[model samples]
Target: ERTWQDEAIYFIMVDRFNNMDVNVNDPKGYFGGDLKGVTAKLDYIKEMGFTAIWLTPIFKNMPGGYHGYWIEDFYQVDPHFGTLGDLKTLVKEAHKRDMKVILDFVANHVGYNHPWLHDPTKKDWFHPKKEIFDWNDQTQLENGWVYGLPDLAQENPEVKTYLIDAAKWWIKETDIDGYRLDTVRHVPKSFWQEFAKEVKSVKKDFFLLGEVWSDDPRYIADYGKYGIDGFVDYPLYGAVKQSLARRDASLRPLYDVWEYNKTFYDRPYLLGSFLDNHDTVRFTKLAIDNRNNPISRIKLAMTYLFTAPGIPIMYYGTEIAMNGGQDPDNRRLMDFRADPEIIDYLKKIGPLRQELPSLRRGDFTLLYEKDGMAVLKRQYQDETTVIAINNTSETQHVHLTNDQLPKNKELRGFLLDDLVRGDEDGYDLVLDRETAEVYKLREKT
Candidate 1:
């Protein structure tokens, strides 16, 4: 958790990112995406300014479980993905480039092929099976097997010991930096407390990013107190989808959502800021539905992502505007080819996050907001940056008072490619629709 601040993460679905060998390809209907594929793309990812890469589970999984989530063996690498050596090499190569590796740790349950699944003695390790029809029922949400997958009994002492010990072993063995904990809400809070304590003991300053697919920050915040460092901010993703990702989407709800992060989270700066991931509809699909996007709306959404206070996560292929509907559809293969415009935009914004401390660790102040336009202030000691966004279809001409930003000073517009001179009272700015502008405060001569 301590290692994540000021870091930009790139999330990759191994099965879909690249395929290196045909034999490995769908070892059981799974296309080839192995450790070598990740090693091959190290330079490309590093060039994009991503300081860390978060990979889905690589543990030995059952056939057809290309996602690596259907864990069949706790300690072995999936043959379909590659041998244990391939994974170690990927980690070593990444660290050589100053990049961190965060493995997706699935403690919620295991594939049916796992030894604990219906084991004479271990079958008791799982909760009693029952059909869960009520989506909102908390008891079912915590106990019910997701998609009929076995739900581990996290409260059991022996189960907690097994999961926690496994977690520690992985960190020590892999030399990896952190974990992207899976299905955090399903596990008992006490387990995270135990898991985190054990993992941190293995390596101090290690990171733990919880995945809780919910839109309520307060609800997600409950997980934060347990032990993991932070959570994927699904609430922020929903707000971004409704506001910036859509042509007709309104910007009103965004303010409240941002407030939720600030009010609820212990470290809002570390929450995973993403528009879409493997579990949801692609942001571009929403753009297409409106019959318009890209070079406008998509860019606008990314602008907020990088400039916002949090650890921004770029879902694999998102930089290229990858398109899909849901689940398997959203997990499309990478084209390698991308819009020159989007790539260039990403190159610019990503590096800026690394260079600008305020973007990662500064205090967030909403200086101005109205209509489809808003100005956000990120201020650090002796350094400040103001972000202005126009989420509407028309260019926005907004005025900023000196109280917001003093006059007769140079406001360096990094993204806009122009400089604005603040006058006696305020600064007048016109930003393109579905676009954003970031300016740094420069001292006057």
Candidate 2:
């Protein structure tokens, strides 16, 4: 089994990654970013040390649009993307390059034009028309539906069978690495349990990552028990965003979430830790007030994202300091024109994460937290890494002791200096406002 910590994921919305199949769709409309486009960018993604890529739903959708969620047919490819064979080729090429692929699957709803829905004979597949505004109501047809989308009632065996079969067919046909399940919590847990079993039967090591956006550990952990291998770490995402944005002072809230996670789930490593995705405002956009010097803050956010206990995911263009605020703005096409210094910093951090066992599987402890400064230590057997973040707007001095450092080693200058080549070191490391440092200790024989 592959632990999430051992992988770095690059999330790409298929429509926005690249457009190799222009003949398939219009530029101003769908733009046709198909599997072929992804195949062309394998080198680009691989260069960044990403072990895997997650594409939004590639299944057939409504015509003349880019939203993959509006599925007209579940079993066929969206002509705008390419043929089914094209998707298979993309998967083969990605695996050939030693990279994994995860397809986004929407189990809870379908588009207005879905074939099943259009057929009056299959009207039983959907719940009766009702307003779904209350999240806690199980009986309300629209309770769990978001944005007025029709909700699927998995309670029906026929609906369950069709969905499970489609999921299996994708894995068997394309040999993709895993799945990123959309709106997992909206569906019944029992359905997911069976669906997971069927999918795992096809590929025993296949990953099942659910989208459960909540801070409740008990609630998220429940999915892991059923069949979900992991979930997007929404709780951690919010905590990190709020903490770094200076909306909160205590690191206790962040640690509290991790602490709850440690005991709540059977496999905490499966959770995908990320700063921002397609849904949220970009980290740099939300955290940095001054665009001229956003690299430092971006570095700090990445440091936490990768070091934290879960699989780290980088939203496309984040390494280059992409900035946008929510929705369509957040979903802007990536620009590869400029080289961001943070990209190089990420390269250094990526290898360090892979080389150090502590980063993959470590015991975490909060060593210090005071006035927009926080220090944390993670240890794995003899190896240790100390991370410090300065969230203030002005340069600040932070102190660390031998105990706070790894292996009880003597206090040293900032860890970032040690990790990044050509950087200086000192007793009291001066961290510019909104910066982070990570120090690795030499093992004692």
Candidate 3:
């Protein structure tokens, strides 16, 4: 199984990443983000502590569009995004910096305008009439489409062979580290088993993260067993939205998901933990009702994201308090020339994650949680780190004791203020609304 815990992934939509080539004919269709532009920003990404970059599909897409979901050609790079050579350069340059790159791959369907649809020699290549398949009934898949998109009949040996070959071709062509599979559940499991076999033969460590957006542990574990290395943790995403929305005050749901992770799956390390992504309302919009009050709430949410278990993923521009209401808006083009304070905060937390092994691999203990306030602890050997968050509108006094700490070693607070230095004894510290603090315990020498 592939391990993602130690890696920080920066996900970017290729069309919106940047426009490096103007000479290419875009035809009012594709957004201008290209391989050259992405390569140019490698330094910026590396500086931000991103160990891997996941780019949306760069394959030839349907005209009059920027999103690459509508694939016109699977084997070729879109001319609007730059030539095949440009992509090779991107992979090579990123590798030079010890950064892994994963491409977004669409396996469920191809565009209606795909060349194979019109191929005279391959007239029988696609399902007839493009009828919608009853997903609940797999037998009806004999001739059906997915959301009107041309679904390849993987049951057809010839179609399966061609699709697997296409995947192999890209791996050989670019030597990317992995793939972020789109619409994984729509495809047959048999196809995936064969696909995994073929992919591992080429690169044994090649990671595959499926989009199985659901809260059911059994559903996610089933995919993992079928050669999928990992899946997005929509269960945790739901918890974040519900928790902040005041739909649920308790962390039971969050704790339930984490506890489920411990024994439910073999590769627990591959789970993707996120607070917001391209599909959800931006955290800024979700957390704060007022425009002026977003920064504090964003910082609090971010602290939880970086310190939590599983592989934490940061949506681009989240650090600077970018705001959007929904789809399309949530995917706003990143503004690079802005305040770097949030960026610095990300960089700071990245190293801290590495320095504190407990943050990444340690078992979690939800010590205390109540209305608008919560306390969590991470314990490893003789060291313990306690994190407290207060979301109340007024200042809160959080009380701590040996019983709550549950550590044999003496506890000490790492107060942020110099005026309160060396105050190791347990005490009540005032936490402002939408703020968090971390206390470290040092063993008596």
Error of 2 at 405 (Å): 5.4
Off by over 4 Å in 1: 1-3, 22-28
How far does residue 120 in candidate 1 sit from its true spot (Å)? Answer: 1.1
lDDT of 2 by residue, 134-218 (tens): 6666555223455666778788898899999999998888898899999887788889999999987998688889998777778
The segments of candidate 2 whose C-alpha lies over 4 angstroms from its true place after superposition are 22-28, 141-144, 246-252, 288-293, 394-432
Those runs of model 3 whose alpha carbons end farther than 4 Å from true positions after fitting are 22-29, 120-124, 128-144, 245-252, 288-292, 380-383, 400-430
Q: Residue 171's C-alpha lDDT in candidate 3?
A: 93
Q: Which tens-of-lDDT digit does each residue in 85-167 have in candidate 3?
A: 99999999999998889888887778766777776756655666556546555544435676677777677777788888988
After superposition on all CA atoms, how large is the RMSD of candidate 3? 3.8
Sorted on lDDT, highest at the top, how do the candidates line up?
Answer: 1, 2, 3
Per residue, candidate 1 scores C-alpha lDDT tens digits across 1-445 of: 3357789899998878887743333223566777889888988887777899999999988767888889988888888788888888999999999999999999988876566775778877998886667867777877988878888997888888888888888888889899999988777788788888888788877899999888779888888887889778889887887787776466666667777788888877789888889888888887887777656766778788888877888898887888888787888778786666787787888888778778887777787777778888899887889888887778888888888776678788888687888888788888877778888889976
Residue 259 in candidate 2, Cα distance off native in Å = 1.8
Each prediction's Cα lDDT score? 0.82, 0.75, 0.72
Least accurate 10 contiguous residues by lDDT in model 3: 414-423
How far off is residue 35 in model 3, in Å? 1.9
